[PDB]
Amino acid sequence: AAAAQVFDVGPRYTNLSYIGEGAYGMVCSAYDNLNKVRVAIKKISPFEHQTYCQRTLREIKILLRFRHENIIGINDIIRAPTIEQMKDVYIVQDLMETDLYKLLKTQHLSNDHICYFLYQILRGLKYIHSANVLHRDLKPSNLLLNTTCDLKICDFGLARVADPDHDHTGFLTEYVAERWYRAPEIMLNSKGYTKSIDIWSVGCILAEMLSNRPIFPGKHYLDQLNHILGILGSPSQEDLNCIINLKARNYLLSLPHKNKVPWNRLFPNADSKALDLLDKMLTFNPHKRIEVEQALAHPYLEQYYDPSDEPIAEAPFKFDMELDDLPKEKLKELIFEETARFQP
Ligand SMILES: Nc1ncnc2c1ncn2[C@@H]1O[C@H](COP(=O)(O)OP(=O)(O)NP(=O)(O)O)[C@@H](O)[C@H]1O
């Protein structure tokens, strides 16, 4: 077994090079001795933990169903031929040279790159939302790029089927997705079961592409709201009237008045069309927040916008995957069945 621990991707995939740690394993580039191209392989070792099996199954089911230029595909899956022998799963993907997080740490983006990246993020997100799926973890590290600036959305581990009828919850309800890209309603009254939570995350990414730093870098759950409201200012009476939960409403009413900080103050060299779209994506009230199809049609993106070339999903997910309380053993059996089509 080739080692890097065991990275047992058989004879086909050779010349392994450690390109990071992952969720439930490590990631390597490798030479595909068949297709004579380098590839990424993610070793996943999740069968110990019911949570790890849930995220692994959800991610495999979604990425096998999706087919889109701006969403990472699965080219291959390597696992043992029997459930008993299966400890690790290896997911083979196109090799991408970098990610937007690594890029923002090191590179000034031109207005043309910001425009093109945002276009490709929304084009992929249109397809995801069209499939009745919410990503729920959009952040720079989950946007891969290659040397010609092609962008692919990855990491569907926290993705869910949209369920707006069941989105409402209490104040300060605990959440999983990265704090800095969390929509204000998450801290207030939302489980994050609506498409508007992804649009908030995209708006945070846009702001981060304009400055190379996170726009709302909260140090904890409730500091996150301090940050958002320091820029958007105090929510309007109308926007408060949409929050019926007394704990969330009275919290907001307890805060001192703050006027909006205008985007042109924060980003004085930004394209004014970019700031108009940013404003529409970072709307406090999720009911007023721009939707993915309206974002694509915004004047900022007019050099790229072509809805005939922005495909939607053939086969939407109609109901959620009832993985909530399956024994890890049933989830290992579902992962086994979902990966069967790659077996010789
Ligand atoms: N197809 C790919 N090509 C190249 N690098 C990749 C690829 N997929 C993931 N990576 C790298 O592996 C890590 C990201 O893994 P990803 O598939 O986004 O899931 P994750 O569980 O979010 N991983 P991470 O948070 O980075 O530890 C980062 O080091 C990426 O830059």
Structurally, what CATH architecture does the domain formed by 13-95+324-342 represent?
A: 2-Layer Sandwich (3.30)
Token pair listed for 238: 């109308």
Residue 137 a catalytic site member: yes
Q: Which of 128, 127, 88, 132 is nearest to 319 (CA)?
A: 132
State the distance from the centre of ligand 1 to the C-alpha of 92, rounded, in angstroms. 12
Cα angle: 206, vertex 96, 175; to 5 degrees:
50
d(CA 12, CA 340): 18
Q: With CA atoms as reference, report the closest residue to 95 among 109, 114, 79, 75.
A: 75
Give the number of other CB atoms < 10 A from CB of residue 29. 17
- In the chain, where are the structural domains located? 13-95+324-342, 98-309
Orientation of helix 272-281 relative to helix 196-211, angle to 10°: 150
**Superfamily of domain covering 98-309:** Transferase(Phosphotransferase) domain 1 (1.10.510.10)
Q: Is 72 in the pocket of ligand 1 (CB under 6 A)?
A: yes
Residue type at 85?
A: Q
Nearest to 155 by CA among 22, 274, 292, 335: 22
What's at 33, amino acid-wise? Answer: N
Whose structure tokens read 């959305």? 153
Is 20 a known ligand-binding residue? yes
- Give, for ligand 1, the residue of 38, 141, 176 to mutate: max count of ligand atoms closer than 8 Å to Cβ: 141
Query: Could you give the CA distance from residue 124 to residue 66 in angstroms, rounded to a whole number?
Result: 10
Closest CA to 152 of 98, 188, 202: 98
| 310 among annotated binding-site residues | no
Distance separating alpha carbons of residues 155 and 137, to the nearest angstrom = 8
Q: Residue 344 and residue 340: Cα distance in Å, rounded?
A: 9
Tell me the CA–centroid distance for residue 221 and ligand 1, in Å. Answer: 25
Burial zone of 122 (CB within 10 Å; 0-12 exposed, 13-18 middle, 19+ buried): buried
C-beta 205 within 6 A of ligand 1 = no
In the chain the first and final C-alpha atoms are separated, in Å, by: 19
Residues 25, 48: Cα–Cα separation, whole Å: 13
Cα 27 to averaged position of ligand 1 atoms, centre (Å): 7
2 is in an annotated binding site: no
Task: Tell how far CA 266 is from the center of its chain.
Answer: 25
Task: At 4, list the tokens.
Answer: 């890097």
Asked if residues 72 and 95 have their Cβ atoms less than 8 Å apart, the reply is no
Atom of ligand 1 nearest to the CA of 20: 29
Is the Cβ atom of 99 under 6 angstroms away from ligand 1?
A: yes
Q: Catalytic one among 32, 88, 137, 198?
A: 137
**Nearest protein CA to atom 29 of ligand 1, as residue:** 20
Question: Quick one: residue 20, left, alpha or beta (phi over 0 = left, psi -120 to 50 = alpha)?
Answer: left
The 3-state secondary structure of the chain, one letter per residue? CCECCECCCCCCEEEEEEEEECCCCEEEEEEECCCCEEEEEEEECCCCCHHHHHHHHHHHHHHHHCCCCCECCCCEEECCCCCCCCCCEEEEEECCCEEHHHHHHHCCCCHHHHHHHHHHHHHHHHHHHHCCEECCCCCHHHEEECCCCCEEECCCCCCEECCHHHCECCCCCCCCCCHHHCCHHHHHCECCCCCHHHHHHHHHHHHHHHHCCCCCCCCCCCHHHHHHHHHHCCCCHHHHHCCCCHHHHHHHHHCCCCCCCCHHHHCCCCCHHHHHHHHHHCCCCCCCCCCHHHHHCCHHHCCCCCHHHCCCCCCCCCCCCCCCCCCHHHHHHHHHHHCHHHCC
* Ligand-binding site membership of 21 (annotated): yes
23 annotated as ligand-binding: yes
Cα distances from 17 to residues 20, 29, 147, 154, in angstroms, run: 9, 5, 18, 20
Q: Do domains 13-95+324-342 and 98-309 have the same CATH topology?
A: no
Q: Which two tokens stand for residue 40?
A: 């990424």
- Do residues 128 and 198 touch, judged by C-beta distance below 8 A? yes
Resolution (A): 1.8
C-beta 88 within 6 A of ligand 1: no
Ligand 1: distance of its center to the CA of 143 in Å?
9
- How many Å lie between the centroid of ligand 1 and the Cα of residue 232? 32
Query: Is the CB of 56 inside a 6 Å radius of any atom of ligand 1?
Result: no
21 lines ligand 1 (CB under 6 A): yes
User: Which residue is listed with tokens 């077996």?
Assistant: 343
